[PDB]
């Protein structure tokens, strides 16, 4: 449809967003080869859900969404329908009727640092679980107790976000992993994000 999809601006960008403040790119009126997602680099995980991986280059959709963030290696299995943990409950939540794919690669060389990379952040605590595709950007103060704190940080009075700590000696599970959720949306009568075919 005369353009090719700027997926590169999302997969290979110099810096990724924190999972509590995850990014979303909306993709339209373009063509793309998902070939690439099968044959690729080490440490790639590439579970899929609504579609079979083999057929993506054939199908067409109204709109694709690219959500992207950094989470921690052993937490990459939260990123799948009907799943629990302090990521799926409090940071990034997929539905059950999830038509899409979940790509995720180690990035110790990009994101770790030799003093600690303390500027990737996650959400510790939330009164309620996140509804699917919700993005709670809130600072707050969370009371984990009894006494109210009226918006000050103290005992049992937690500032709700915490910094990951990324050293490159951490070993594969405490190591930063970049994650991208592609979402394939079939809606009204323009279907404008197709593959080579």
């Amino acid at each position: 449809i005369t353009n090719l999809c700027p997926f590169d601006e999302v997969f290979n960008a110099t810096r990724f967003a924190s999972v509590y403040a995850w990014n979303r790119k909306r993709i339209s009126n373009c063509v793309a080869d998902y070939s690439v997602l099968y044959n690729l680099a080490p440490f790639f995980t590439f579970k899929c859900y609504g579609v079979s991986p083999t057929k993506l280059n054939d199908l067409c959709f109204t709109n694709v969404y690219a959500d992207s963030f950094v989470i921690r290696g052993d937490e990459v299995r939260q990123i799948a329908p009907g799943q629990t943990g302090n990521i799926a409950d409090y940071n990034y939540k997929l539905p059950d009727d999830f038509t899409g794919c979940v790509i995720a690669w180690n990035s110790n060389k990009l994101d770790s640092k030799v003093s600690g990379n303390y500027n990737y952040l996650y959400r510790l605590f939330r009164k309620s679980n996140l509804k699917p595709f919700e993005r709670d950007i809130s600072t707050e103060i969370y009371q984990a107790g009894n006494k109210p704190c009226n918006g000050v940080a103290g005992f049992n009075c937690y500032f709700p976000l915490r910094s990951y700590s990324f050293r490159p000696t951490y070993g594969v599970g405490h190591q930063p992993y970049r994650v991208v959720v592609l979402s394939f949306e079939l809606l009204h009568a323009p279907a404008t994000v197709c593959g080579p075919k």
């Epitope: 090719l4 999809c5 997969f11 080869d33 070939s35």
Partner: antibody
Framework: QVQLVQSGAEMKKPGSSVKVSCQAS????????ISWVRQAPGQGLEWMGG????????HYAQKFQGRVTITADESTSTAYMELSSLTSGDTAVYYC???????????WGQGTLVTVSS | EIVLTQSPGTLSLSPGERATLSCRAS???????LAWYQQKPGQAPRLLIY???SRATGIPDRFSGSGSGTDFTLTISRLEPEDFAVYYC??????????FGQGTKVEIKR
């Protein structure tokens, strides 16, 4: 790693034309943007034109309309670059370079010297 | 029709010092799609910086690019003997429309 093998050095007599070639082993030749870059000796990189093979619509730089023509062939997955009406100003190294919609590197080929002289 | 314009033309700096190269556009620029090359004599351009910010494989730490919009900057922190070249800044879409800068020449001062 997907390799960009360019065709070999040439000598063309002035007034003629030349057709440099560029081949993509494997990958996804059809959905790259292929592009040709000139450097005359002692001077700076000049962008000449480019093509997405899956669209066969190529675009050229305003410095070259009447002379250059880019084409590309899905079957053997090579693009071509055809410069007409040559003169001594055109003695240069001619590089093809590709970018992909999955990554922000631009990848370069080997280079090809064209010498224009009798 | 983008016109990138490097500044200065020529840099003489004695070694170890702080090298700062400017690139300016005639419009604003997506900045994911802006690269930096070094060229030393008789060699092909070599990619240093892509996506305005990322260093390319093998390039030393003391090279670094930043900037946005209409104003991008390659910085060499600890300039060394072998570190004179012509530096080009390129802009490049996922479409057939790219451009380069006339270049910036860097050299050692004795």
């Amino acid at each position: 790693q997907v390799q960009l093998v360019q065709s070999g050095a040439e000598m063309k007599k002035p007034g003629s034309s030349v057709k440099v070639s560029c081949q993509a082993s494997g990958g996804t030749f059809s959905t790259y943007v292929i592009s040709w870059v000139r450097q005359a000796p002692g001077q700076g990189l000049e962008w000449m034109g480019g093509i997405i093979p899956i669209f066969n619509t190529p675009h050229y730089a305003q410095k070259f309309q009447g002379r250059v023509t880019i084409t590309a062939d899905e079957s053997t997955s090579t693009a071509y670059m055809e410069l007409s009406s040559l003169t001594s100003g055109d003695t240069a190294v001619y590089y093809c370079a590709r970018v992909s919609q999955w990554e922000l590197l631009v990848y370069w080929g080997q280079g090809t010297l064209v010498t224009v002289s009798s | 029709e983008i016109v990138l314009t490097q500044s200065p033309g020529t840099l003489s700096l004695s070694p170890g010092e702080r090298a700062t190269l400017s690139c300016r556009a005639s419009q604003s620029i997506n900045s994911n799609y802006l690269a930096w090359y070094q060229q030393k004599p008789g060699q092909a351009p070599r990619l240093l910086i892509y996506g305005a910010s990322s260093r390319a494989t093998g390039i030393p730490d003391r090279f670094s690019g930043s900037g946005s919009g209409t104003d991008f900057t390659l910085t060499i922190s600890r300039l060394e003997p072998e570190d004179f070249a012509v530096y080009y800044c390129q802009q490049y879409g996922v479409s057939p429309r790219w451009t380069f800068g006339q270049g910036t020449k860097v050299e050692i001062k004795r």
